[PDB]
Write a protein that binds this DNA or RNA. Structure first.
Lengths: 115, 174, 76, 137, 97
RNA sequence: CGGAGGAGUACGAAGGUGCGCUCAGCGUGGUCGGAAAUCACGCGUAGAGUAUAAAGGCAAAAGCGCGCUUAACUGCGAGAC
RNA sequence: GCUGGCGACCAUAGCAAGAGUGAACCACCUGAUCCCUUCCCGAACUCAGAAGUGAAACCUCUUAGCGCUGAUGGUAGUGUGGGAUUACCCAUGUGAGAGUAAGUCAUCGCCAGCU
């Protein structure tokens, strides 16, 4: 069971630093089947925009690789631009910045969020 | 082994020990090989000979083990090499297991050394095999001082009886 | 003859601004050898564990978190 | 001569003896006991003398519980020495006694013999005492 | 029934440190009564009656009756305080039975 | 001229940063190998450690590793003790 | 009414024991071709996937078993005035710690899926 405990332990420092800095957070989650990304306000208890591969437009695909993550990033970027958030801090939630999450981050960056 | 185990021993052990679900059928996860070569500090060559021995016996590179804490009764220091260890999993573990069980056991002069006991109370078995000989490498000639191996099989088995059943199914003598 | 008779100079540690007082940015709030109090919002920590205010406002003490740590913060 | 096997420090401050003994004022081990009524100090020699008197009188027919231990050291100056120049040297050990503190308990004898032994012992002590017996509450 | 204690109400102006010391100087004993479904009740007892009752052994295991005028309570002894040096009872607790 | 202890140093990494990891104890088995070297699995648990005396601290560990490096910078500095 | 994420709070909320959950989600799960990875090991990190299982794990439910919370009354201490000096007493104000009765198997907020 130490897998998830280790992941949360790894995420703690980045989350606390972002909270102390006071910026808007962009948080991601990854499972073998799906990927999720939500934009959370500074206080940490309200969300502005959200996106995931559970979306009806995208749920029909493979949902578990880099290609799906690319459109997830594009979707969250376009939805966050609607809410009006521009500057964000990326929170990898204890994952490595590699592969699917890196693709999602690059897609959001091309979408228009600067980070 | 691999496929042979998956084909026979799964269902055989399931019906033998009367287990309801497949997910808890006993398996072997890893095998650890150790040489605790104490007092390597004086010679510095027996240890690198031991790492070579491990390299030939198992097709994996060994990692030297540093001491933890210093004891006056012995001569070991805070963090200096005092041993060597290797872990084997996957297909390499099945390989080493079969090339050991089939070949090495008849080779040694004594027999019945490994009792049906010595499980650690949770289904993992430990044995000691003496002399680096009886292994697919060169004999007493072209080797350095003789050495012994410690072999531990760690299993998903919960009880000693289930561990014993899994080992005897593969062909562990006792 | 005694082998004792030494002591060190005083250091003047302790709380300098109490709850309810108004501060300006840069005011020192706590002098402390270790981290008996921790830095909350608008409060910074120096290299010797001194706590100071980084904005104008009112000082407030509290107990917070899963470890029961004592925090001091500044409300603007 | 009771005395601690080892101590964290060798010399201690004088202090003050105030208050009552709410702890250690109930008969717990035996059936009859002797307890102090006014405060004072008790030395290891006094403890030994009272114990010897009680044991000799009751002829070791029961069991004696001692509930005081002398864990406080007392210093003195070497005599003909002037004031100053450091604290003195440890001479003897004492226990501080507050009113209500139980000193000795006896188990397994008749009350007449226990009371006679306690009366013999009370003449060796530097403060007033009294006799108590166990009670439900 | 067999054990009966006459008591008088102890009021707020009779509660406290100085009030309790004055009561004991008048040879009285403070007591409290608590238990299921009712609020605590503070009462005053007679020292001689309490000592006489405590001398008997059945007092600690039998239901006793406390009478404050018309109000009657059936209780068991729960806790007792004694002076460390004189062994005089100083305060009593009674749990409703 | 009360009761107890330390200092007159060390380190180009034992500094910076990014990423990563948790101690100590006991119990089982396992060659020499045992009271106590290393290996594997459990139990309860901060009692380990922090260059050095004690105290105040230490999970975003301030404890422990690896890669790259010189912010062990220049001019200052609102405001405080 | 379930599932996931992120917070408020930090034991009345925690541990322990026992029992359930697979439609979806989550979890184990397949192998290691490319990205990446171990002072050795696809064990962890990573990628490419759904043939199996809810066994383990995570959640939810029950229990006062351990733990935690906790009165009222009394006692200790104590500021001011007075009386005494083994450190107490009176007037007045204040008031623990321990223990007793009793309580507890939490409570809220934002978003997204499934009925």
């Amino acid at each position: 069971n130490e897998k998830k405990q280790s992941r949360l332990r790894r995420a703690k420092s980045t989350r606390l630093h972002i909270r102390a800095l006071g910026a808007t957070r962009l948080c991601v989650n990854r499972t073998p089947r799906h990927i999720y990304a939500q934009v959370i306000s500074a206080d940490g208890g309200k969300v502005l925009a959200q996106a995931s591969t559970l979306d009806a437009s995208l749920r029909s695909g493979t949902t578990g690789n880099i290609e799906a993550a690319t459109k997830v990033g594009a979707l969250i970027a376009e939805r966050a631009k609607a809410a009006g958030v521009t500057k964000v801090a990326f929170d990898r939630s204890g994952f490595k910045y590699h592969g699917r999450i890196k693709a999602l981050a690059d897609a959001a960056r091309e979408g228009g969020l600067e980070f | 082994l691999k496929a042979r185990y998956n084909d026979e021993l799964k269902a055989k052990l399931q019906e033998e020990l009367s287990i309801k679900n497949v997910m808890e059928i006993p398996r072997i996860t890893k095998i650890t090989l150790n040489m605790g070569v104490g007092a390597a500090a004086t010679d510095k060559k027996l240890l690198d000979g031991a790492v070579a021995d491990m390299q030939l016996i198992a097709g994996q590179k060994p990692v030297v083990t540093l001491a933890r804490k210093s004891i006056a009764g012995f001569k070991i220091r805070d963090g200096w090499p005092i041993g060597c260890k290797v872990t084997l999993r996957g297909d390499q573990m099945y390989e080493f297991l079969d090339r050991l069980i089939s070949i090495a056991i008849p080779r040694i002069r004594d027999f019945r050394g490994f009792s049906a006991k010595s499980f650690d109370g949770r289904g993992n078995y430990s044995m000691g095999l003496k002399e680096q000989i009886v292994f697919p490498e060169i004999d007493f000639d072209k080797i350095d001082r003789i050495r012994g191996m410690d072999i531990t099989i760690t299993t998903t088995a919960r009880t000693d009886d289930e561990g014993r059943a899994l080992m005897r199914a593969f062909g562990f003598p006792f | 003859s005694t082998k004792n008779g030494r002591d060190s100079n005083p250091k003047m540690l302790g709380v300098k601004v109490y709850g309810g007082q108004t501060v300006t940015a840069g005011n020192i709030i706590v002098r402390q050898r270790g981290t008996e109090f921790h830095a909350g919002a608008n409060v910074g920590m120096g290299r010797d564990h001194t706590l100071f205010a980084t904005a104008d406002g009112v000082v407030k003490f509290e107990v917070k978190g899963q470890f029961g740590r004592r925090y001091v913060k500044v409300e603007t | 001569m009771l005395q601690p096997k080892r101590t964290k420090f060798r010399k201690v401050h004088k202090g003050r003896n105030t208050g009552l003994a709410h702890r250690g004022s109930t008969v717990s081990f035996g059936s009859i006991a002797i307890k102090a009524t006014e405060r004072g100090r008790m030395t290891a020699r006094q403890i030994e003398a009272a114990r010897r008197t009680i044991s000799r009188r009751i002829k070791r027919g029961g069991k004696i519980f001692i509930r005081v231990f002398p864990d406080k050291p007392i210093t003195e100056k070497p005599l003909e020495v002037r004031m100053g120049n450091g604290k003195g040297n440890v001479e003897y050990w004492v226990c501080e006694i507050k009113p209500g503190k139980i000193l000795y308990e006896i188990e397994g004898v008749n009350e007449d013999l226990a009371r006679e032994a306690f009366a013999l012992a009370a003449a060796k002590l530097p403060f007033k005492t009294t006799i108590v017996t166990r009670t439900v509450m | 029934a067999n054990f009966v204690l006459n008591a008088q109400a102890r009021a707020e102006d009779k509660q406290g440190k100085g009030a309790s010391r004055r009561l004991r100087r008048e040879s009285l004993v403070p007591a409290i009564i608590y238990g299921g479904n009712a609020e605590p009740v503070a009462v005053t007892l007679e020292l001689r009656e309490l000592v006489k009752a405590l001398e008997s052994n059945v007092f600690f295991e039998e239901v006793v009756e406390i009478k404050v005028g018309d109000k009657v309570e059936n209780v068991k002894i729960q806790a007792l305080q004694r002076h460390p040096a004189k062994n005089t009872p100083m305060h009593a607790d009674f749990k409703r039975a």
